[PDB]
Amino acid sequence: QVQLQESGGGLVQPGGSLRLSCAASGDTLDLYAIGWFRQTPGEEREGVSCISPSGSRTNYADSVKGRFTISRDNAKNTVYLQMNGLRPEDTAVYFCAGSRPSAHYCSHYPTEYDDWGQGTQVTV
Amino acid sequence: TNLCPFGEVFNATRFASVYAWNRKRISNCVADYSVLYNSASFSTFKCYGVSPTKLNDLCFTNVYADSFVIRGDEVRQIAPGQTGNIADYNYKLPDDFTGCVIAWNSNNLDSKVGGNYNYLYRLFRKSNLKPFERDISTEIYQAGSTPCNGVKGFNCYFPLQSYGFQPTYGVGYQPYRVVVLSFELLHAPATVCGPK
Ligand SMILES: *[C@@H]1O[C@H](CO[C@H]2O[C@H](CO)[C@@H](O)[C@H](O)[C@@H]2O)[C@@H](O[C@@H]2O[C@H](CO)[C@@H](O)[C@H](O)[C@H]2NC(C)=O)[C@H](O)[C@H]1NC(C)=O
Incomplete structure (x- = not known):
């Protein structure tokens, strides 16, 4: 199991961009899928994007399709979320989570992930 | 030469209840674990003491495949050192488990409308x-x-x-089929190897 730490959150004008980072410590990320989730106050975590261990499969929620891009860097043990065209609806705490599925699997389902980061605040 | 009958395990029409978990002994056959791992099929494919892509390099006396259905939010209990109703009373792995836990959502097979x-x-x-x-x-x-x-x-x-x-909204409440692979070495010739 890894420990994950989110970085790169902050305040942004509507229309701007952010690049979140999910840094992993302990294990290497070779066997991990990484998913990005967001959570507005009093609400439930919404899966937004994920990447399979192989990096061959990336899935995006419809709400962010075309504006968000997920990517992995196994050498740095970090996964990134590029967030373009940010609307105030995208304001939330963003978490990254990890799991060990088969090589080309990843989902947006929170119960399919084991390891969670503390989150970082994105404010549009 | 004979391929191991993993199809009979993973694609069985019926799976056991977890309290009555099934065990299938695999022996005298060629096992391709990498073909299982290198797929989009499994939401859990966790191996303990070994990496999934290294299994094909090894030879065992027997392989045991334990299989059953639990809730998606219970798959986490099928691991060393866990507690809860499933780990405590239904299926318990040892602290020193070496082997793999493989799971996939079986809503379409195992849920019913009523x-x-x-x-x-x-x-x-x-x-x-x-x-x-x-x-x-x-x-x-x-x-x-x-x-x-x-x-x-x-x-x-x-x-x-x-x-x-x-068929609920949250997948955590849906059925998942689980296969636990454990690998046995006896003072006897190996009978289950990866491809050459
Ligand atoms: C479990 O079964 C799936 C699906 O099997 C279907 O296709 C096979 C042909 O292999 C057919 O005989 C069977 O009756 C079903 O109609 C297997 O997954 C398929 O595997 C084949 C190769 O064997 C691939 O070409 C397919 O793309 C693939 N399809 C899917 C959806 O995965 C799977 O291999 C079987 N699992 C085991 C462990 O044997």
């Missing part, structure tokens, strides 16, 4: 299972100080409870 009551789990037991122990008894569970005389009633509960799997 609920699939055929899948059960043990809710009450006098003590925790030891690793790889199995308990399929159905004696009435004495939860209080009155003996039950084999009949349910006051503080006397049937020990198995149904999942009643239904």
Whole structure:
């Protein structure tokens, strides 16, 4: 199991961009899928994007399709979320989570992930 | 030459209830674990003491495949050192487990619109299972100080409870099929190797 730490959150004008980072410590990320989730106050975590261990499969929620891009860097043990065209609806705490599925699997389902980061605040 | 019958395990029409988990001995065959791992099929494919892509390099005397259905949010209990109703009373892995745990959502196979009551789990037991122990008894569970005389009633509960799997919104409540692979070495020639 890894420990994950989110970085790169902050305040942004509507229309701007952010690049979140999910840094992993302990294990290497070779066997991990990484998913990005967001959570507005009093609400439930919404899966937004994920990447399979192989990096061959990336899935995006419809709400962010075309504006968000997920990517992995196994050498740095970090996964990134590029967030373009940010609307105030995208304001939330963003978490990254990890799991060990088969090589080309990843989902947006929170119960399919084991390891969670503390989150970082994105404010549009 | 003969490929191991993994199809019979993963693609079985029926899976066991977790309290009555099935065990299949695999032997005298060629196993391709990498073909299983290098797929989009499994939401859990966790191996302990070994990496999944290294399994094809090894040879074992026997391989055991244990299989059953639980809720998606219970798959986390199929791991070393876990507690809860499934780990405590239904299927227990040892602290020193070496082997793999493989799981996938089986909503389309195992849920029913009105609920699939055929899948059960043990809710009450006098003590925790030891690793790889199995308990399929159905004696009435004495939860209080009155003996039950084999009949349910006051503080006397049937020990198995149904999942009643239904097509719910949250996948955590849906059925998942689980296969646990464990790898056995005896003082005997190997019979289960990867491809050459
Ligand atoms: C479990 O079964 C799936 C699906 O099997 C279907 O296709 C096979 C042909 O292999 C057919 O005989 C069967 O009756 C079903 O109609 C297997 O997954 C398929 O595997 C084949 C190769 O064997 C691939 O070409 C397919 O793309 C693939 N399809 C899917 C959806 O995965 C799977 O291999 C079987 N699992 C095991 C462990 O044997």
